[PDB]
Paper text:
Nicotinamide phosphoribosyltransferase ([name]) plays an important role in the biosynthesis of nicotinamide adenine dinucleotide (NAD+) via the nicotinamide ([name]) salvage pathway. Here, we demonstrated the [name]-mediated salvage pathway is functional in the Gram-negative phytopathogenic bacterium [name] pv. campestris (Xcc) for the synthesis of NAD+, and the enzyme activity of [name] in this bacterium is significantly higher than that of human [name] in vitro. Our structural analyses of Xcc [name], both in isolation and in complex with either the substrate [name] or the product nicotinamide mononucleotide (NMN), uncovered significant details of substrate recognition. Specifically, we revealed the presence of a [name] binding tunnel that connects the active site, and this tunnel is essential for both catalysis and inhibitor binding.
To gain insights into the functional significance of the tunnel in [name] catalysis, we introduced mutations to amino acids within the internal cavity of the tunnel and investigated their impact on enzyme activity. To completely block the tunnel, which had a large diameter, we made multiple substitutions using bulky aromatic residues simultaneously. This led to the creation of the H175F-I224F-V291F-I332F mutant, where four residues were each replaced by a phenylalanine. The crystal structure of this quadruple mutant was determined (3.11 Å), which confirmed that the tunnel had been successfully blocked. By comparing the structure of the mutant with that of the [name]-[name] complex, we discovered that the presence of the aromatic side chain of Phe 224 caused a conflict with the [name] molecule bound within the tunnel. Consequently, the binding of [name] to this site would be either significantly reduced or completely lost in the mutant. Specifically, blocking the tunnel caused a 129-fold increase in Km and a 3.35-fold decrease in kcat for the substrate [name], resulting in a 403-fold decrease in catalytic efficiency. Consistent with the positively cooperative model and the existence of two [name] binding sites, the hill coefficient of the quadruple mutant dropped to 1.00, indicating a loss of positive cooperativity after blocking the tunnel. Our ITC results also supported these findings, as the affinity between the quadruple mutant and [name] was undetectable, indicating a significant reduction in [name] binding at the catalytic site without binding at the tunnel location. However, the quadruple mutant with blocked tunnel was significantly less sensitive to FK866 inhibition, exhibiting an IC50 value of 153.54 nM, which is more than 600-fold higher than that of the wild-type enzyme.
Author numbering:
A (entry chain B): 1 to 227, 258 to 274, 278 to 395, 406 to 432, 435 to 468
B (entry chain A): 1 to 394, 406 to 431, 435 to 468
């Protein structure tokens, strides 16, 4: 934990010597962050707040410069000792950058400006590029939140078709079990938090801690206890029904027994357990005309991904069973099987000021922002010189400037913005 | 950082309530960790030491029990306050387990015991199950160390065939630059170190920090300065020569390595248009090694294409193997590199007559991020529990260890009751009851891994 407490060493090695590459007379730089495309056409922005709280949690000190100058020397990189000491002494160790971003939770289509980073000091103009490495890692919470959100839209579709209470049923249909299948503890926390943007169920306790620490939400999610959750193979409802009357506390305690298989094809086993359970406890028909099992539910934790989950939901509703009957769990397929290429996540330089003049660097160019249309709500990237010309708002807000986080969200605010977005 | 400082909450939610599901009269549990196949047939064991140093860094406190009791109650899971308060009171907050593992760096064939966790107390027999979630995440440093190692064996082959100094050329052939394409800071550090088991090149500074903090290696890796393509452009189309000229002015010192970026078509232009014919100055005059990194073209072709273009611009010498080695310049390919594409490049350029010395690789997301727990089908399984003083079994069953054959050096899993001769127990007790009994320097880790071949 404490051995990583040096912001000056939280970058790519070649960044320590990057300021020497600028043309003479540079005094400002402007960067933006976009998803160039990939699996989905829209991304739920989330995570930057957690990143800034943890990666930039205190002013840079002279001890930071001392330790970094030593290592980077031995490591093989020139290090701007003058510029960093100037930041500690002149700017009080507060990074001279301004970060604007779309509110965390908003779902924005790809190829659009999600963040902008701009230097606020002429001497330390190079600080944005230095911070590119740790800021670009916002791809991960963004990408996980998008996955959990895209899955939410699949279940919302089927609940709306087959459930008498879709929006009540929905927040408990995806549980994150990915703590063991993720690359590190911090990734479990942050990534697990990205899932909590869309659902209330998670077994990643580390997501609870980060949500409370970085988003002011004490108990952001709930979980499943087992021993009512019970494990099975699919062929034990097959057995215990007609090779018996284990209707012992199931009907007597009146509890909701969640039957979870762990073997078989994710689509077939779910339909099998539904049918078997229907022949063991009966069912009732809701207002939509779909059957809802009595007491028993099915939980599928194995083999769930967005495509296999849609397959399951298609099969069971065509059989006449409401989406209320099942719930899903995703583990590694939610927190680990994603990368920066999944949504083609980039941080691009768009503008530098050289000799008092801004010049374009080149997909998008110049000093940019995100606009939201007042009537339709649709998004489009545009230049800062275009916020004046009125049936449009600047969709970004300054969240961080010169050491002070200017805008914070609660996880409930984030959940609100994600839940309003559909499709 | 500090908000995670509670071991009691570093697990799956249902694992906090797992002690309720043992039979009555249980007084011991025994678990093992294996890779049950996957992409590769062998895995380089690494990372467990860092995991234990960071995840278990202090005794369990009563405050920890207070917070975990409160949260798990609101969250919806039973929490064994009784067992944990007894551990803090009686066992001084020291986890009553013993962890044995193969020495970090060893490359072990899949389907073999790599770790064993056993309880050392009759009351707190369930502690291993509780620690399963954090321990199983050893899949990540094992998988990344294996990936870097499998790539090393590929480069070793073509260096052995085409280079006059293979083992000297090898440790700088794969640079990890994936600090930006990894899921978090902690994964960057631990993952970057897993790659440092096999190579000396990295831009992941956080790997240096973890290697210094958890593996007693002060400066475990080295880097060179490299030209960013966005920054060169800012100089303007007019002063584009002057950008590279300054690039050499800052970093191109005699024994130094400097990396510049261009495309397939600029090197083509520079040669037969003479626009930068003045630019062979202080590439040659500096005596530095200028790495040319492409940003356009097919990842396999641009390597050979740059080699040929550079072969004209700077000439070459023919080594003892008969393979050409460019003067001053080298090629660095960081885009699209994976074990199979890297093998493709080396196949192409050597068949063209160029020694593997000419090229060097960087991997980003494909090394630190494009891996999962299924990559090596990594498992943690209970194999034995003691019930009423009697051990009962739960691929493998019973209480297990790893054996290495004295003559061949081959590995096989076996029962503890079977160390009866001409084989040594390949495991060592690294952690027991709060004490880390064995630690390794990264160089000790590097030594074990470098000896394994194929």
């Amino acid at each position: 934990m404490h051995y990583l407490d040096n912001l000056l060493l939280n970058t790519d090695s070649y960044k320590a010597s990057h300021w020497l590459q600028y043309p003479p007379g540079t005094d400002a730089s402007f960067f933006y962050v976009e998803s160039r495309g990939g699996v989905y056409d829209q991304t739920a922005f989330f995570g930057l707040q957690s990143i800034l709280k943890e990666a930039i949690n205190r002013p840079v000190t002279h001890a930071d410069i001392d330790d970094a100058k030593a290592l980077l020397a031995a490591h093989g990189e020139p290090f701007n000792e003058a510029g960093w000491r100037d930041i500690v002494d002149r700017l009080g160790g507060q990074l001279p950058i301004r970060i604007r971003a779309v509110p965390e939770g908003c779902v924005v289509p790809t190829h659009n400006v999600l963040m902008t980073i701009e230097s606020t000091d002429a001497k330390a103009f190079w600080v944005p590029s230095y911070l590119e490495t740790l800021l670009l890692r916002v791809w991960y919470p963004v990408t996980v939140a998008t996955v959990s959100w895209q899955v939410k839209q699949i279940v919302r579709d089927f609940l709306q078709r087959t459930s008498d209470d879709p929006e009540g049923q929905l927040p408990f249909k995806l549980f994150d079990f990915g703590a063991r299948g993720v690359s590190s503890l911090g990734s479990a926390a942050l990534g697990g938090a990205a899932h909590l943007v869309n659902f209330l169920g998670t077994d990643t306790l580390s997501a609870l801690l980060l949500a409370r620490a970085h988003y002011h939400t004490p108990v952001a999610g709930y979980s499943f206890p087992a021993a009512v959750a019970v494990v099975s193979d699919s062929y034990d409802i097959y057995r215990a029904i007609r090779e018996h009357t284990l209707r012992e506390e199931i009907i007597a305690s009146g509890a909701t027994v969640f039957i979870r298989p762990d073997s078989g094809d994710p689509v077939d086993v779910v339909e099998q357990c539904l049918l078997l359970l229907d022949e063991a406890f009966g069912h009732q028909v809701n207002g939509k005309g779909y059957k809802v099992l009595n007491h028993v539910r099915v939980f599928q934790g194995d083999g769930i991904n967005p495509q296999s989950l849609r397959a399951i939901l298609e099969r069971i509703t065509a059989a006449g069973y409401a989406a209320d009957n099942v719930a899903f769990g995703m583990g590694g397929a939610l927190l680990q099987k994603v990368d920066r290429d999944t949504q083609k996540f980039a941080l691009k330089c768009s503008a530098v000021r050289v000799d008092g003049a801004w010049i374009d660097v080149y997909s998008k160019r110049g000093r940019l922002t995100l606009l939201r249309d007042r009537a339709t709500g649709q998004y489009r990237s545009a230049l800062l010189d275009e916020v004046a010309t009125g049936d449009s708002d600047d969709a970004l807000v300054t969240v961080w400037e010169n050491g002070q986080m200017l805008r914070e969200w609660t996880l409930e605010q984030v959940r609100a913005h994600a839940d309003a977005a559909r499709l």
